[PDB]
Design a protein around this ligand. Structure first.
Ligand SMILES: Nc1ncnc2c1ncn2[C@@H]1O[C@H](COP(=O)(O)OP(=O)(O)OP(=O)(O)O)[C@@H](O)[C@H]1O
Ligand SMILES: Nc1ncnc2c1ncn2[C@@H]1O[C@H](COP(=O)(O)OP(=O)(O)OP(=O)(O)O)[C@@H](O)[C@H]1O
Ligand SMILES: [Mg+2]
Ligand SMILES: [Mg+2]
Lengths: 193, 636, 273, 638
């Protein structure tokens, strides 16, 4: 008799170990997932890493937005611009279109400061005008002074000065990103204080 | 201030030790180097015969002979090329890093019709990796026969070769040392020649005494020429090659006889110039995705000499099935000629290889039977490419063929789905499951198929990862039918009836939420069932039932986060089913009846069955079904 | 000897330069969208310089012609000097134009390569193979002819393989002797071991029969996994190296059954003769 | 005869072109080579100071500095080493393939207490990978300082250097090309030093004018900052593995792997012989989120030769199942390529692999004694241990003793197979186990009821990797692993149970065959044995093939062949319990009338519920749902 064979062992091997499976997006400021300042300092540090890496490769973005960020399962943030997922997140130079090419790193640092503000306060910047006509007025006039009064209590003061300097309307005095790495380092070192 | 100009010197003994010892990590490349030198000699003597055939009047043939000899422990490689005079025998074979091949090539620059394999000048001394002492017996057409000899000690001797005369060429005699006698074995020589120099344009012949005569005395020598039997077919123009010749080359490439499915013969010209020839195997290899097989599908050739095989930088992991040859002329090579100096040249090559492979697949998608066979073989690779290769996702997705409701037992393309799709419909309705029949007759697809909408089945586990990244096709998004809130074109009557139903079915829904507060995170009424009472769809964020099954079955997964991205079960009930009508009638009378909660939990468990989930433990469900069958047949 | 043209290559979707805090699928599109913009800007720059050079060449030709005309005509000495000054200014502009041309030539030299400019497509040809599929099982026609050719040419290979017993030696040999594994060779091996059992050579009996059963097992495995037996023979030895004791039990039971069957066939042949 | 001896020569221009172009695949290793030369010089001067400290009067500190100068497009590399005289400057730096370091090492002569990272003599010329002109300004103790200068044009000049004086050592000025300017930035310099030469025995301090000067009572950004950060950490593995404390090991581990917490266990060992190396192996406290993501490649183990990076771990240095192990392997005598980025003998890595694997397994064995820490190790790397059981075959016996499992007599704590074998009865000759999907899914399951009734232990394996582990693990001490989900399960019985089972089989054979006809192609055969207590039916798998969970695992693998999906699957052997009321009350309904619609439906439903309980998915679950709904409607009154 030729039996049945009991051969097996064809492809019962541990084949390629695949990846993927994430937690969620960044549009969670309306979900109200606000936590203690540790998980906010870490997010700011990782996103500053990403922005500084982008600046090193001389890549101009100008389009940093709460929609343009993604959080991953390992508590790592992948800041990749996920297409659509606009208003109030731009820069006066971008809005004016005087040169027809407003692509400059100062726009990146202004957008980063706006992102830091909306991350640390948990509320949209300039959260007092919801009119399409009115919002463009501030950037068109070239003088836009935001307010920082909804800050969460018991937080390090480095972020306050950082967001104050980042959103300033002088293109030759905004803080560069090498400043931001030192700022976030002293920020995480000032957590226990 | 004074300037004392000097000139760079070299320490010859240490330089020779560097070339012998710290220069070639693979000891078997010496044969490749010697055969490349022989090929260069033959190319020289064949190029000189172009102007006048008198240069060839010492033997017509241009051949390479490999002559192992284990009695004296020597390996002789004989060519009939150009040879070299005493002056050349000194200048080229005595001066390290000086190449007569380079000088010969740089001399012409006006009738360039040869591609000569050599520019560095150190390749010959690689013969000292395996040989303790080499003797080079050459004979040019302009000089007498000479006998170069050196033990790599710092000196070489040149004699007049008072012995056996050779007509022309060179005869490198490697007195192999004690350790490296393995290169006299026929199998080892055949393996090395086939691996490294098997597309050399001159017959490479192995000589050994193993053939018997009529049936003893093996004195006769086996003139085994079949070391270089397969000629490089990618050199000829694509118009000049017939299907049969491509098939023969493909069979010779794979060490197994079977025809190929399709062929791609292309070339790019510019700063980076190469000829490629890519083959789609007729059937997928039985170990195609076994990671233990490394990767050797695509082989890189520089001037018809093997350099490196596939790496992740030459061909993506999802195109590891398609095998071929990439031959280039000008590539910046390492000193050992087994890797490129610039490694991103490999990536620029890959950028063309992948584009041409996708063009080959697209052109293969014009005869339905051939592509049906190709898809049955490599649909997994296509979907892996959709998941992994993002820059080609749009083009790769048009190569997807899926079973669907309106096609039957033939797979149909998503573009054809969009063509047949109704104007009112504005999404791609797909169901991911475990088999063809399991999803064909399922709770979620009942209403969609009843209204005539086409549904794309996705049976294989690879489809979960395929649709992780395929979130949109042709501008119309892919929405699962197992996810909650399935948006469907609602007529006025249907939506009015739905509003009335949720205005009528709220009490038992609150009862469901109360009895099932941890298992189920929402109970509602939706119009996706026609003939089933309840199905558990998953919330729009998280893992579906099938995706959760697949990811839970993975052998190597971080089990800590399995509950991090787990499904959110949303049990839903079908208002028109008689079971839910009776249940509502029984729940209106009282909310704490034993029968009500029994039937509700059993409905939830049987919908967990139907929806593709798995229970916490099916023993409880089996025990309750056994108690019910005992009640039915009456044994207490 | 000189690799200075391959040291500046900017591949966009370069997988080995990725930041684990940036989306690789979105990192590879930022690089592309900047690369194409650099190309467009440089193209417009060199195009406008080319048209400016053409315009200045036409202007200097016209000014030279007008200078010749004014020199021919008497009475325009002051106009001749004014046009000489104008032509000197035009020639200064003309010679300054090539400064920017050399500048952009140097910039092109310093501009890195990429997949778009490294190579230009040559002559590509895709052509699909259409060959008959499936095989036929017959006891006559080509199968018998192939059997006779195989036994006439590869008798020595069959004998040498049958003389071996070692699993590793068998695998190495069959790696060098892939032709020995097919259904026709299986039939020849069966009839050959039956003939040997007629001749009553016990050592050669078991030596041939064990390898015959090994090849039959390999063929059964190949029929099971839907790939040709001529290539998968290598995996059966590795399988039996780590196989369960039950696999050895089944193999030895098949050995015993084959022994009994071939012994019965040999006894019947002897009795008939 | 007419023999005539010549001498081997070289073409210098071509040889220099070979060094510059065809030796080193990465241009950034010029800095590694220069720092290696600086380290060799410092070793020279220190060793010479050991005998006569009178030659250390021309400077005391032994320090390497890198001074990028973006203004002049230069990268100086000063060093307070030994310097070179005019003769040494002409010979060592002018003659290709001649090494002064090798000459010095060969002059140590029984008293050699130092190691040097220079032997070939071509390393210095890697500076022309990035630098178009190299100006070396050296100063020996017993010679004035000379300014060597070359452009790799086949000539060099050696002037008197009437410029600014230095006490000792060498100042290798590189004039970088117009396009190799990325090596002036702090990012690339720090990256290169960290990657290649971060364990050089002397402080490598980097200089840049980026300091923000203090201003109070503007925005000044022009001040040099001496950043010795390039070489803060020391090569701890050069010390004895006994005089080091756990805090030093933890600090080194945190610095090496950038972990925010220290290590879990450390194995520090070195082997002496023909192949010698010091190895420092750490077990990370928490496994990475992508430990098995092979597309991330592998750099866990780093190979150093004389404290200089050679190559990060490949497939041949550490097994894939030990890829969690972080550490370094440092060897003094390893033959290297000309690029020093690989070993000449790749077969050496196999001996190193054997030693590393043996010592890692010894580390695991010595860690297991402290159960408090072994639980922390196991709950993180049990998958790796089981993958080692599956793949590795020579260390399977040693690796099996590190397996901890849930049994039926343990509770919430895992126990090893040795504790099993300790608690087995005298008449038990096997280790019972079950492969399921969760702990509770198998704790109360059909196949385990009788076994726990007799008070046997059952190992609960609720992970997908466990089926792979146990299809290879076939014994322990002599007690074979026998699944309770497979057919032919034998328990220690006596004559009484044997005759009772024989009577039950003889009574129920008619029911079994009738059920087989009802379930013709859906069950291979219907059995009766002692596996169930309070359940009527459970389907077991043929004695060899795929269990229910194994088939469930292999049907859900993304990259699996879709052609062998039927040739290995289970041969479902349904079993009935001859003591449960349900099956015997339908035995009467069977012997009363074989063909009965009620009996048909009951048998099909019972087989389907056994299918669900055992683990096999239904062929089409909507059929089971529909028959459940019909039965609910019938028993509910609608
Ligand atoms: N069989 C041969 N016939 C003629 N000349 C030969 C032969 N073998 C070697 N030579 C001579 O030896 C010289 C140097 O040999 P070697 O192989 O080291 O250099 P190469 O061919 O330039 O190779 P590589 O650049 O790969 O190191 C060649 O220029 C050639 O003139
Ligand atoms: N900074 C330095 N101080 C002292 N001697 C130096 C210095 N730089 C180079 N040298 C001398 O120059 C010689 C040649 O330089 P090179 O770096 O090429 O050689 P090597 O270090 O011995 O070789 P390799 O590193 O390639 O094995 C060295 O052997 C050493 O004697
Ligand atoms: Mg050569
Ligand atoms: Mg050095």
């Amino acid at each position: 008799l030729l039996f049945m064979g009991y051969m097996t062992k064809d492809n019962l091997a541990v084949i390629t170990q695949w990846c993927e499976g994430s937690s969620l997006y960044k549009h969670l400021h309306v979900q109200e997932t606000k936590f203690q300042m540790f998980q906010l300092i870490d997010i700011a540090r990782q996103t500053a890493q990403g922005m500084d890496y982008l600046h090193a490769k001389n890549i101009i973005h100008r389009d940093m937005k709460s929609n343009n960020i993604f959080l991953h399962e390992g508590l790592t943030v992948k800041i990749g611009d996920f297409g659509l997922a606009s208003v109030l997140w731009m820069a006066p130079e971008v809005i004016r279109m005087q040169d027809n090419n407003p692509f400059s790193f100062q726009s990146d640092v202004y957008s980063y400061g706006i992102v830091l503000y909306e991350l640390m306060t948990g509320e949209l910047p300039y959260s007092h005008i919801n009119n399409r006509d009115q919002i463009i007025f501030m950037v068109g006039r070239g003088y836009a002074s935001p307010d920082l009064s909804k800050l969460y209590k018991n937080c390090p003061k480095a972020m306050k000065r950082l967001v104050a300097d980042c959103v300033k309307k002088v293109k030759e005095e905004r803080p560069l990103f090498p400043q931001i790495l030192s700022s976030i380092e002293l920020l995480q070192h000032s957590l226990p204080k | 201030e004074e300037v004392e100009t000097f000139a760079f010197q070299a320490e010859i003994a240490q330089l020779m030790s560097l070339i012998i010892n710290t220069f070639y990590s693979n000891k078997e490349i010496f044969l490749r180097e010697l055969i490349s030198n022989a090929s260069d000699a033959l190319d020289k003597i064949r190029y000189e015969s172009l102007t006048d055939p008198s240069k060839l009047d010492s033997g017509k043939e241009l051949k390479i002979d490999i002559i192992p000899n284990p009695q004296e422990r020597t390996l002789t490689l004989v060519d009939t090329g150009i040879g070299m005079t005493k002056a050349d025998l000194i200048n080229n074979l005595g001066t390290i890093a000086k190449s007569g091949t380079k000088a010969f090539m740089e001399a012409l620059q006006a009738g360039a019709d040869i591609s000569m394999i050599g520019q560095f000048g150190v390749g010959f001394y690689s013969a000292y990796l395996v040989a303790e002492k080499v003797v080079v017996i050459t004979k040019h057409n302009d000089d007498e026969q000479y006998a170069w000899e050196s033990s790599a000690g710092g000196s070489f001797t040149v004699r007049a070769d008072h012995g056996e005369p050779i007509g022309r060429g060179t005869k490198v005699i490697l007195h192999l040392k004690e350790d490296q006698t393995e290169y006299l074995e026929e199998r080892r020589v055949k393996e090395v020649v086939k691996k490294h120099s098997q597309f050399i344009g001159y017959p490479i012949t192995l000589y050994l005494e193993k053939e018997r005569e009529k049936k003893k005395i093996k004195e006769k020598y086996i003139d085994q020429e079949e070391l270089n039997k397969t000629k490089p077919i990618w050199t000829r123009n694509p118009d000049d090659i017939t299907q049969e010749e491509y098939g023969e080359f493909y069979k010779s490439l794979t060490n197994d006889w079977e025809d190929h499915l399709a062929v791609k013969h292309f070339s790019v010209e510019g700063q980076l110039e190469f000829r490629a020839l890519l083959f789609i195997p007729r059937r997928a290899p039985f170990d195609l995705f076994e990671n233990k097989k490394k990767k050797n599908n695509i082989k890189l050739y520089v001037r018809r000499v093997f350099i490196m095989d596939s790496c992740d930088e030459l061909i993506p992991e999802y195109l590891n099935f398609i095998r071929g040859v990439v031959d280039s002329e000008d590539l910046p090579l390492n000193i050992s000629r087994e890797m490129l100096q610039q490694s991103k040249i490999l990536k620029v090559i890959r950028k063309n290889i992948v584009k041409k492979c996708l063009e080959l697949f697209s052109e293969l998608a014009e005869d339905k039977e051939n592509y049906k066979k190709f898809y049955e073989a490599f649909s997994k690779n296509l979907k892996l490419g959709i998941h992994e290769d993002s820059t080609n996702r749009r083009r790769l997705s048009e190569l997807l063929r899926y079973h669907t409701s309106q096609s039957g037992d033939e797979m149909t393309s998503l573009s054809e789905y969009v063509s047949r799709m109704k104007e009112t419909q504005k999404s791609i309705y797909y169901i991911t499951g475990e088999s063809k029949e399991q999803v064909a007759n399922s709770a979620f697809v009942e209403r969609v198929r009843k209204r005539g909408f086409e549904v794309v089945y996705m049976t294989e586990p690879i489809d979960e990862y395929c649709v992780q990244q395929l979130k949109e096709f042709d501008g119309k998004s892919l929405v699962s039918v197992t996810k909650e809130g399935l948006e469907l074109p609602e007529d006025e009557e249907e939506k009015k009836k739905m509003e009335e139903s949720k205005a009528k079915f709220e009490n038992l829904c609150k009862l469901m939420k109360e009895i099932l507060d941890k298992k189920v995170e929402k109970v509602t009424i939706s119009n996706r069932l026609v003939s089933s009472p309840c199905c558990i769809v998953t919330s729009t964020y998280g893992w579906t039932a099938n995706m959760e099954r697949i990811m839970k079955a993975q052998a190597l997964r971080d089990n800590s986060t399995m509950g991090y991205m787990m499904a959110k079960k949303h049990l839903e009930i079908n208002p028109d089913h008689p079971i839910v009508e009776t249940l509502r009638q029984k729940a209106e009378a009282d909310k704490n009846d034993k029968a009500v909660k029994d039937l509700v939990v059993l409905l939830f468990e049987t919908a967990l069955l139907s929806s593709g989930f798995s229970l916490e433990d099916p023993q409880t469900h089996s025990n309750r079904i056994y108690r019910m069958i005992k009640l039915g047949l009456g044994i207490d | 000897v000189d690799y200075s043209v391959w040291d500046h290559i900017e591949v966009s979707d370069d997988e080995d330069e990725t930041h684990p805090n940036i989306d690789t699928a979105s990192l590879f599109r930022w690089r592309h969208q900047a690369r194409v913009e650099r190309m467009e800007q440089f193209q417009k720059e060199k195009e406008e310089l080319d048209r400016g050079c053409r315009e200045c060449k036409r202007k200097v030709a016209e000014c030279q012609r007008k200078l010749k005309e004014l020199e021919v005509a008497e009475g325009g000495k002051a106009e001749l000097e004014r046009l000489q000054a104008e032509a000197q200014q035009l020639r200064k502009e003309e010679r300054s134009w090539e400064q920017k041309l050399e500048e952009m030539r140097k910039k092109e030299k310093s501009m890195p390569w990429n997949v778009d400019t490294l190579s230009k497509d040559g002559f590509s040809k895709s052509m699909v193979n259409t060959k008959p599929e499936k095989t036929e099982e017959d006891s006559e026609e080509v199968r018998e002819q192939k059997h006779k050719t195989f036994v006439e040419k590869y008798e020595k290979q069959i004998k040498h393989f049958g003389m071996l017993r070692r699993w590793d030696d068998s695998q190495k040999y069959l790696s060098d002797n892939v032709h020995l594994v097919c259904e026709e060779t299986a039939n020849y091996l069966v009839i050959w071991c039956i003939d040997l059992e007629v001749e009553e050579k016990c050592a050669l009996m078991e030596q041939v029969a064990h390898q015959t059963i090994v090849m039959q097992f390999i063929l059964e495995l190949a029929k099971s996994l839907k790939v040709d037996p001529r290539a998968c023979f290598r995996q059966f030895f590795t399988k039996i190296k780590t196989a369960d004791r039950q696999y050895m039990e089944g193999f030895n039971d098949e050995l015993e059954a084959f022994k009994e069957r071939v012994r019965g066939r040999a006894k019947l042949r002897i009795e008939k003769a």
